[PDB]
Amino acid sequence: ASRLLLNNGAKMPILGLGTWKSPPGQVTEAVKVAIDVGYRHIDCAHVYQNENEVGVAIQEKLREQVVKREELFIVSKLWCTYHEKGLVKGACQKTLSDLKLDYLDLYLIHWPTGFKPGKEFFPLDESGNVVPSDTNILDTWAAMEELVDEGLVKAIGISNFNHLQVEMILNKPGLKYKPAVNQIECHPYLTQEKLIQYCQSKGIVVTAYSPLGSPDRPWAKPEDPSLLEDPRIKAIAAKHNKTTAQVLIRFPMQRNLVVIPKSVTPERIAENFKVFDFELSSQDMTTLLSYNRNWRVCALLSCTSHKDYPFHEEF
Numbered sequence: 001a002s003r004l005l006l007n008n009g010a011k012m013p014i015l016g017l018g019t020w021k022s023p024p025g026q027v028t029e030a031v032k033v034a035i036d037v038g039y040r041h042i043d044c045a046h047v048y049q050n051e052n053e054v055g056v057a058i059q060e061k062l063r064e065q066v067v068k069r070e071e072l073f074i075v076s077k078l079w080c081t082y083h084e085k086g087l088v089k090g091a092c093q094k095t096l097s098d099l100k101l102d103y104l105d106l107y108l109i110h111w112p113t114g115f116k117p118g119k120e121f122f123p124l125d126e127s128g129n130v131v132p133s134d135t136n137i138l139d140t141w142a143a144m145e146e147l148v149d150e151g152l153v154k155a156i157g158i159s160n161f162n163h164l165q166v167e168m169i170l171n172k173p174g175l176k177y178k179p180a181v182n183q184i185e186c187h188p189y190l191t192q193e194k195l196i197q198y199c200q201s202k203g204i205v206v207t208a209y210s211p212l213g214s215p216d217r218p219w220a221k222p223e224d225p226s227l228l229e230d231p232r233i234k235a236i237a238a239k240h241n242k243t244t245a246q247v248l249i250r251f252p253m254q255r256n257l258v259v260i261p262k263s264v265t266p267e268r269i270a271e272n273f274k275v276f277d278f279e280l281s282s283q284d285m286t287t288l289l290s291y292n293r294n295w296r297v298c299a300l301l302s303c304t305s306h307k308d309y310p311f312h313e314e315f
């Protein structure tokens, strides 16, 4: 159906709306339009600096009775400067205040890397590199498990964890709640077959972020590759009378992945929803998988020496 069953018994909508880089001034309208169109899952984060304005839209639609809270699935993420056991709750309560909710459906550790606490999201060492915290992943997972026992979040997960870091949590002595979700970058140029196969075999649901290749990412140099413009993907979409974006959103769905395209444009938010009415053939799916080139949009390049940097491992 549009929902995948989580290990806590909840069902997660397979399509959600992303909000990274959605400006405060445009995201309230964008989330309102998305809920009107039929979106029931919104992906958020403290570091996107727009959760208050996302929260204005959810309140509006709740008040309107367009949707009840139980049918919404709201996701946010713990930023790297809040990995200390004593800061996790406070970070979650700030997000809950900004979103004006009393619980989150899913809360994710945004990156495995902890940074020193403070007001800068990427603290620098007077001079140059990002200043790390000495916290580790298991300390932060224990603080996340407390949030479930206190009723603030219904499920907890991870994002950008490689398979060894997931295995580290899965083997934690006294593990009380397994990660429900691992949210990772995934699209035809970074197909992630080994990490998806690992997670799915452990009962962890995978969410594909940057499904369209994030054409608005700030560091967009390469002058090269664009997924939306790839003539080979345009040809598959033409065969189905769909747009390239609709093919790129349908592709993770047929791999049993949740997918969270971002848009602040009403026509594209609506376009992106019309993805339940067609099917990519096996041939189309094998062809899209063959375009992998291990190209990653989000490589957290300022942290390549951090003890917990996730992308040195094969997967």
Ligand SMILES: NC(=O)c1ccc[n+]([C@@H]2O[C@H](COP(=O)([O-])OP(=O)(O)OC[C@H]3O[C@@H](n4cnc5c(N)ncnc54)[C@H](OP(=O)(O)O)[C@@H]3O)[C@@H](O)[C@H]2O)c1
Binding pocket: 017, 018, 019, 020, 021, 043, 044, 110, 159, 160, 183, 208, 209, 210, 211, 212, 213, 214, 215, 216, 217, 228, 243, 245, 246, 260, 261, 262, 263, 264, 265, 268, 269, 271, 272, 298
């Ligand atoms: N956990 C993490 O580390 C992490 C990292 C990155 C992203 N994410 C999540 O994943 C979400 C999606 O990834 P993303 O924001 O990197 O990028 P994306 O969804 O791959 O691409 C967004 C870009 O595509 C455009 N777009 C959307 N629909 C389109 C369509 N039908 N036709 C043409 N262009 C279209 C958007 O334009 P307009 O907005 O102008 O329409 C925007 O410029 C994020 O917003 C965030 O919620 C999570």
